[PDB]
Amino acid sequence: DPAPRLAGPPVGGPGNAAFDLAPVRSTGREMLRFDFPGVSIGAAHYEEGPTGATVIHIPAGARTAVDARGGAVGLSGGYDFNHAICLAGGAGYGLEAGAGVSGALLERLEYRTGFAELQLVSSAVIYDFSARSTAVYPDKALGRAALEFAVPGEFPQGRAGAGMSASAGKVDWDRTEITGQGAAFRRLGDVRILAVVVPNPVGVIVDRAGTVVRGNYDAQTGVRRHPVFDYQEAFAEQVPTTISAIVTNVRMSPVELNQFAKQVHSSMHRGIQPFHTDMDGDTLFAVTTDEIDLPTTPGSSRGRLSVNATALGAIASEVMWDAVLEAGK
Amino acid sequence: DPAPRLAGPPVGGPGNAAFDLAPVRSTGREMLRFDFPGVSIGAAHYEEGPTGATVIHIPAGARTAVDARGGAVGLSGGYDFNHAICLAGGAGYGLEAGAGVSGALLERLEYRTGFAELQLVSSAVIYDFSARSTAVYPDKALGRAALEFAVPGEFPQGRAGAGMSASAGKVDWDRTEITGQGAAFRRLGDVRILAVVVPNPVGVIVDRAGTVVRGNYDAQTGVRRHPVFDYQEAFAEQVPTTISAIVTNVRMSPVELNQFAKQVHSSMHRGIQPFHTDMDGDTLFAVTTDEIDLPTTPGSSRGRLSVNATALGAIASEVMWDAVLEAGK
Amino acid sequence: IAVDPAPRLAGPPGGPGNAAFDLAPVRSTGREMLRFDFPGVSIGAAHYEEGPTGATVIHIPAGARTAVDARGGAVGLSGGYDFNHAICLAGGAGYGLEAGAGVSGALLERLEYRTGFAELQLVSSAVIYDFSARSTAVYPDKALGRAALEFAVPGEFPQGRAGAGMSASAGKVDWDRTEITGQGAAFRRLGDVRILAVVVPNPVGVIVDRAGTVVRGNYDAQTGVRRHPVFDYQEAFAEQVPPTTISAIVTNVRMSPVELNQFAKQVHSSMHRGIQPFHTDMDGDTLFAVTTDEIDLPTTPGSSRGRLSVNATALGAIASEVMWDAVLEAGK
Amino acid sequence: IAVDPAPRLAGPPGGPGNAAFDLAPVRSTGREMLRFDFPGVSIGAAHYEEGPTGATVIHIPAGARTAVDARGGAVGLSGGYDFNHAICLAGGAGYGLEAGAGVSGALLERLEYRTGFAELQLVSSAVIYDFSARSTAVYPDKALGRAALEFAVPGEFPQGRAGAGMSASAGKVDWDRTEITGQGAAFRRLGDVRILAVVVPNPVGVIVDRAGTVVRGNYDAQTGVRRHPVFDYQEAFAEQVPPTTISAIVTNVRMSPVELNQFAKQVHSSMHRGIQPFHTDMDGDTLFAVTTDEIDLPTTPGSSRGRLSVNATALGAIASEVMWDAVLEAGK
Ligand SMILES: [Cl-]
Ligand SMILES: [Cl-]
Ligand SMILES: [Cl-]
Ligand SMILES: [Cl-]
Ligand SMILES: [Cl-]
Ligand SMILES: [Cl-]
Ligand SMILES: [Cl-]
Ligand SMILES: [Cl-]
């Protein structure tokens, strides 16, 4: 039962043109540290929003699967191979941050443009305008800044980057609470799994016991409700987005990687409820650096079908739940 | 903590040609009764398998969305409008049951064949051969029988129809348990929601507290395990299907219905874990009889965004969890 | 081909169904047999005279990686697997998917009822609606699918009114101008490379040759000629709004799942050259792209004819021509 | 069109990028202006001489229901929304998606920075890779997209080397045979019905006319003629294996989401008539089908020209011809 963080009602607010916007390097509430060679993370925000962008930079490039769900997807690129993933606020306007990343990467490549040297950035967005009283959005300059701020082995938890103005629980805006962004990391032997998430759900964040921990908080009661209780009573009366990434170092074929993405994404309906709704633009990127082979056969002491991409997906699903809970903390 | 129902190892077994197969009307462990005009359910099995088929008959026809996930889908038709949904065992061979339904419906239509009089049956299957020691599968005659046995307002819970030899928890077959089929029903005002499920998951059935209730039972310990505990230890050591239907009477557009299907299907990763894996052929049919309008605006005392298809999806997700728990009981 | 200019109007359309008849499968021989050299690939074609309707089965007993491309609002598909031991094409609209169950059951029996997951016999099936072209309600049933498998012959294909093509037809702006088509196949061997195309065109649109001439469908008995449907459509709009094809490519060239899928889409779209309109809401157009995984593409795509000349796209372009030839055989 | 037979080889391809230049947007006028009567639809085209590269923006301020059809292995798409206030087509490969951000930001400013979910300004963008056709690394940036919006003119389209078409090219079996294309548009009014096609063909394949003649791309300077790529591909295989197009249709006819989506697929596939090969792994082919929802189809599909003559499929067939005309304008 954490203390509430109600977003409150928005107030006609100023947009980008009204300000000389200074990027700020986001530090969040605390820094997660981890060991994942070849992966860097940067996060930048404008205090003016507040709104921001979070960039996962994999300079060598990495094979990717994208799983998009719901009626409000805001996606650019969605490539099967990426040098960066850019997550941002600002609704569709915030896809501009990824253009800032792309242009910067072209500069770093000394303006080479061979079809194979193309720098590929996939971007996804949350609508974060109800949670504040301005129209500032992540722009090209903010995406460039997030890339510039990227470093190996660090992630700023909470109100940082794309998570500045993320919020949950939207049966009614009077009960919506600020979330954040979150990350979690596990290493098993040589295997590495990093989960990054920016939950801006219509639904609420739920822990492993089934407790609603963030979103749909009623100030009249002091208690959070699972949305289904509201929905069911609404029917009886009246009749008559989360953007995320997994990054791993395990080699998976295109088909395995795509099904892994679907599996991990669906697993997030455990910690976010409802999820994958028409109201949401839920988008997960599954990224592999293609470093570690799975064994040719899937046995172990733990079972005949225990070491495969599905197994990896189950583990990664837990890392992602932990990240969602970090974002809601 | 229910008593175990381990499937045990399969034993070269006989197939359909070896028997004079008599359809049996499946009664299960108990009958669910409900009120849903225009919907009938029949279930038939062969004791010889044991294996069976469950048919949802909507004689007027109903708009449908199909959501298929994983690497082992076995689907026929997958139509956007159906007179029947046929769920069966027998792996891909059991898709034949749906042909029995289709042919019977043509007969009932007096052999009319105008493109608009076409009788549309969508079928999906589970692989149920590891859970028994024969190669008998649901054939045309069994599908016809299931249709013949269909009645309004009844569903046979447990080991009935397609659920005869369904099983869960397949990290290792020594720990796999027999499930069944399940159904649940809710009425809210005029709104009706029926969930039908045949869980044959690689994963396990999980209740709302997070307890593993069916699948991955270790006879050496007397306890069921969430598969992720096995998977994670397998990695540390070695490196280095569910078919379902919702049926409702609420009018939804094609787009709403499709997103509703996705939402409800993903919600099942709460009660089945892992879910939507490469190993699974998970297929959900969302069917509406298009009887009840939702209101033009989505408000109620419960919230400004409380009465819409997403709301319906959240409610239906709970009905489906209840059905999954019925199947595992 | 030399297409026969003569009309073959289907005519209009209280039809009897399967059990009204003592249905004996007939091995379809069509108008002519195509012979092709592609070890591992057999084709069987069976029909019921009483429809007339039929099924055509491509049997690849090793199993072969497959991509499925389905378009339009009227798809009738079973299985649609990424690996198949057989592809079953049939008449009878959705009822004719039953033929593929006949194939599946027969293959299980041939496998001595083994049911290990790696032993599952996988059949993908697709259908055309062929009831407008005849009075009956007879459809390709499980017996007919089993018969088409039993009748499969290595390296032979019956052109014309045979198997699934027995009551196929084209050009459906008005049924008075619809003509019977058939099924068709074509084959090319280029070096070591083998490409087989099989098609059962039952289009809303018409069959068009490489010169742009409409050669089958939309025959107006009042004019004696076939014109493109667009002329009828444009005249219809000016007046009233005043101010399926099922097919397979089979090749022996190794393609990854991703390459094979995009090859399928390319070849399928290429068929809008020979069938117009195509991929419509009215159509259940479904193409299966199958590779037997026998021969590698070179690791680099060069030749004397260009730096990007030997790759899956190039193979797709070649296969597209084989498919157009098959479409013209069906319409001949 | 009368296509110019003369070659326009792109030539081969250490190129400077955007900030190397003081980049002034130029309003593109192309070779000729198409004028069309479609209230609510404007087109702006802007280029940078220093590329040369550009962007073409279709501005529909009411917003319009859209279906997106994307094919191939090289798609470069932003938004891909089911409802759009603008469509932005650009060069610069994935970098040129930035032009659409310029459009989006400008539209937000025009909306006085209102951000209610029902007020969100939705821009879908798609790109061609046009860097082989020039030395520079200049790409359509946010300023260029904003300029293309600012330059939008109701009912006018600049044909040829203009906007996104400034460095578009066709026929990429070998770059030595690649020719500059352009952008193209065509428009038809039939009764009350309006159909606009816009295309930016940068294909791997070639542009083909209705007679089957290759008219742009794969020009062999050693022969003086263009032949179909398949001749090169087949010769390449015999030797070595021995024994993007971005486009939009815009119409005023009401179509449901399902009809509009299948219309998009039909029209897109129809472009394999005029662009061959098409929908290849090599291509990022993306078509936007947009309806302004002004006029109903009749409730029944009859006319004197047939019982199934007035429906979305019929509209698709008509629109397919408008699109082929646009492709030929681009290649002229
Ligand atoms: Cl929000
Ligand atoms: Cl927890
Ligand atoms: Cl199993
Ligand atoms: Cl429970
Ligand atoms: Cl027909
Ligand atoms: Cl045989
Ligand atoms: Cl190019
Ligand atoms: Cl303007």
Tab-separated table of N, CA and C in Angstrom, chain A residues 35-88:
chain	number	residue	atom	x	y	z
A	35	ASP	N	25.633	-5.291	-15.776
A	35	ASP	CA	26.748	-5.631	-16.637
A	35	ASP	C	26.233	-6.221	-17.936
A	36	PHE	N	26.215	-5.443	-19.001
A	36	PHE	CA	25.687	-5.943	-20.283
A	36	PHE	C	26.521	-5.284	-21.379
A	37	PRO	N	27.652	-5.887	-21.707
A	37	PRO	CA	28.493	-5.284	-22.718
A	37	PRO	C	27.764	-5.053	-24.030
A	38	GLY	N	28.023	-3.891	-24.604
A	38	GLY	CA	27.468	-3.503	-25.892
A	38	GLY	C	26.122	-2.842	-25.876
A	39	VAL	N	25.595	-2.609	-24.688
A	39	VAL	CA	24.334	-1.945	-24.491
A	39	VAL	C	24.559	-0.710	-23.609
A	40	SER	N	24.057	0.419	-24.047
A	40	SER	CA	24.127	1.678	-23.301
A	40	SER	C	22.701	2.226	-23.156
A	41	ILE	N	22.433	2.992	-22.108
A	41	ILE	CA	21.127	3.600	-21.891
A	41	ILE	C	21.321	5.051	-21.543
A	42	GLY	N	20.566	5.938	-22.186
A	42	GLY	CA	20.532	7.344	-21.850
A	42	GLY	C	19.106	7.810	-21.635
A	43	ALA	N	18.911	8.784	-20.762
A	43	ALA	CA	17.610	9.332	-20.502
A	43	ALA	C	17.755	10.825	-20.324
A	44	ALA	N	16.876	11.565	-20.978
A	44	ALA	CA	16.860	13.024	-20.922
A	44	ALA	C	15.448	13.493	-20.763
A	45	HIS	N	15.267	14.647	-20.133
A	45	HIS	CA	13.953	15.237	-20.003
A	45	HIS	C	14.016	16.732	-20.144
A	46	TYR	N	12.843	17.309	-20.396
A	46	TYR	CA	12.612	18.735	-20.259
A	46	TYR	C	11.782	18.908	-18.997
A	47	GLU	N	12.299	19.716	-18.052
A	47	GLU	CA	11.537	20.086	-16.853
A	47	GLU	C	10.263	20.852	-17.205
A	48	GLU	N	10.312	21.541	-18.359
A	48	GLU	CA	9.254	22.362	-18.876
A	48	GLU	C	7.971	21.552	-19.110
A	49	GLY	N	8.132	20.268	-19.364
A	49	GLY	CA	6.975	19.431	-19.629
A	49	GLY	C	6.171	19.172	-18.366
A	50	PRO	N	6.677	18.333	-17.442
A	50	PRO	CA	7.875	17.502	-17.615
A	50	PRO	C	7.582	16.325	-18.555
A	51	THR	N	8.555	16.020	-19.407
A	51	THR	CA	8.422	14.919	-20.343
A	51	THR	C	9.824	14.519	-20.753
A	52	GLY	N	10.004	13.308	-21.268
A	52	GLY	CA	11.326	12.898	-21.638
A	52	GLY	C	11.392	11.733	-22.590
A	53	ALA	N	12.617	11.303	-22.842
A	53	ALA	CA	12.927	10.211	-23.731
A	53	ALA	C	14.009	9.347	-23.098
A	54	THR	N	13.917	8.036	-23.378
A	54	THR	CA	14.886	7.048	-22.914
A	54	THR	C	15.343	6.274	-24.144
A	55	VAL	N	16.650	6.195	-24.320
A	55	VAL	CA	17.271	5.585	-25.491
A	55	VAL	C	18.125	4.428	-25.066
A	56	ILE	N	17.888	3.269	-25.674
A	56	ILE	CA	18.713	2.075	-25.561
A	56	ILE	C	19.562	2.029	-26.819
A	57	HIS	N	20.863	2.174	-26.666
A	57	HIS	CA	21.817	2.221	-27.782
A	57	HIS	C	22.630	0.933	-27.791
A	58	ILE	N	22.590	0.236	-28.939
A	58	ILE	CA	23.352	-0.953	-29.156
A	58	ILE	C	24.222	-0.696	-30.406
A	59	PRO	N	25.415	-0.141	-30.213
A	59	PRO	CA	26.105	0.430	-31.342
A	59	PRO	C	26.370	-0.562	-32.461
A	60	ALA	N	26.589	-1.844	-32.137
A	60	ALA	CA	26.812	-2.836	-33.186
A	60	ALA	C	25.581	-3.157	-33.986
A	61	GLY	N	24.409	-2.797	-33.489
A	61	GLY	CA	23.147	-3.218	-34.067
A	61	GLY	C	22.742	-4.564	-33.568
A	62	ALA	N	21.442	-4.777	-33.432
A	62	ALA	CA	20.902	-6.019	-32.900
A	62	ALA	C	19.578	-6.383	-33.544
A	63	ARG	N	19.456	-7.667	-33.853
A	63	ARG	CA	18.165	-8.212	-34.315
A	63	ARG	C	17.042	-7.992	-33.305
A	64	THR	N	15.891	-7.630	-33.862
A	64	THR	CA	14.756	-7.178	-33.060
A	64	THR	C	13.471	-7.777	-33.602
A	65	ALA	N	12.561	-8.101	-32.713
A	65	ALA	CA	11.159	-8.346	-33.029
A	65	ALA	C	10.311	-7.299	-32.325
A	66	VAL	N	9.259	-6.854	-32.979
A	66	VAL	CA	8.334	-5.876	-32.431
A	66	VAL	C	6.983	-6.485	-32.274
A	67	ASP	N	6.374	-6.331	-31.115
A	67	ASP	CA	5.019	-6.770	-30.873
A	67	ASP	C	4.161	-5.568	-30.455
A	68	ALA	N	3.340	-5.070	-31.376
A	68	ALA	CA	2.420	-3.936	-31.124
A	68	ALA	C	0.950	-4.414	-30.881
A	69	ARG	N	0.261	-3.887	-29.848
A	69	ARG	CA	-1.108	-4.252	-29.477
A	69	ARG	C	-1.961	-3.047	-29.100
A	70	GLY	N	-3.237	-3.126	-29.401
A	70	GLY	CA	-4.182	-2.072	-29.047
A	70	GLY	C	-4.440	-1.077	-30.175
A	71	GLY	N	-5.257	-0.063	-29.878
A	71	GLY	CA	-5.714	0.886	-30.887
A	71	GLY	C	-4.983	2.205	-30.936
A	72	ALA	N	-4.001	2.370	-30.056
A	72	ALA	CA	-3.333	3.650	-29.887
A	72	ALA	C	-1.822	3.551	-30.045
A	73	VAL	N	-1.375	2.612	-30.864
A	73	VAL	CA	0.048	2.453	-31.070
A	73	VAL	C	0.624	3.698	-31.704
A	74	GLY	N	1.763	4.128	-31.195
A	74	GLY	CA	2.558	5.184	-31.826
A	74	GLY	C	3.975	4.679	-31.993
A	75	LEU	N	4.291	4.222	-33.223
A	75	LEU	CA	5.518	3.515	-33.550
A	75	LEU	C	6.150	4.105	-34.804
A	76	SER	N	7.465	4.274	-34.772
A	76	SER	CA	8.252	4.588	-35.960
A	76	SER	C	9.322	3.537	-36.170
A	77	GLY	N	9.482	3.151	-37.421
A	77	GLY	CA	10.502	2.188	-37.805
A	77	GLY	C	10.087	0.770	-37.587
A	78	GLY	N	10.058	0.350	-36.336
A	78	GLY	CA	9.712	-1.019	-36.047
A	78	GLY	C	10.566	-2.009	-36.764
A	79	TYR	N	11.848	-1.710	-36.877
A	79	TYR	CA	12.755	-2.467	-37.692
A	79	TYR	C	13.103	-3.792	-37.032
A	80	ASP	N	13.489	-4.748	-37.908
A	80	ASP	CA	13.971	-6.066	-37.475
A	80	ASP	C	15.437	-6.085	-37.105
A	81	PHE	N	16.065	-4.912	-37.098
A	81	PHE	CA	17.468	-4.745	-36.735
A	81	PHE	C	17.608	-3.296	-36.310
A	82	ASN	N	18.168	-3.037	-35.115
A	82	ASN	CA	18.221	-1.695	-34.614
A	82	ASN	C	19.557	-1.396	-33.963
A	83	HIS	N	20.018	-0.157	-34.176
A	83	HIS	CA	21.097	0.445	-33.417
A	83	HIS	C	20.575	1.161	-32.183
A	84	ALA	N	19.314	1.551	-32.145
A	84	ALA	CA	18.766	2.155	-30.935
A	84	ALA	C	17.260	1.939	-30.902
A	85	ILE	N	16.744	1.912	-29.665
A	85	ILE	CA	15.326	1.956	-29.375
A	85	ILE	C	15.088	3.253	-28.599
A	86	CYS	N	14.123	4.065	-29.042
A	86	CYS	CA	13.811	5.306	-28.389
A	86	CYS	C	12.369	5.285	-27.874
A	87	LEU	N	12.228	5.420	-26.574
A	87	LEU	CA	10.934	5.452	-25.891
A	87	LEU	C	10.695	6.890	-25.443
A	88	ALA	N	9.510	7.440	-25.651
A	88	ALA	CA	9.319	8.848	-25.327
A	88	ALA	C	7.901	9.153	-24.960
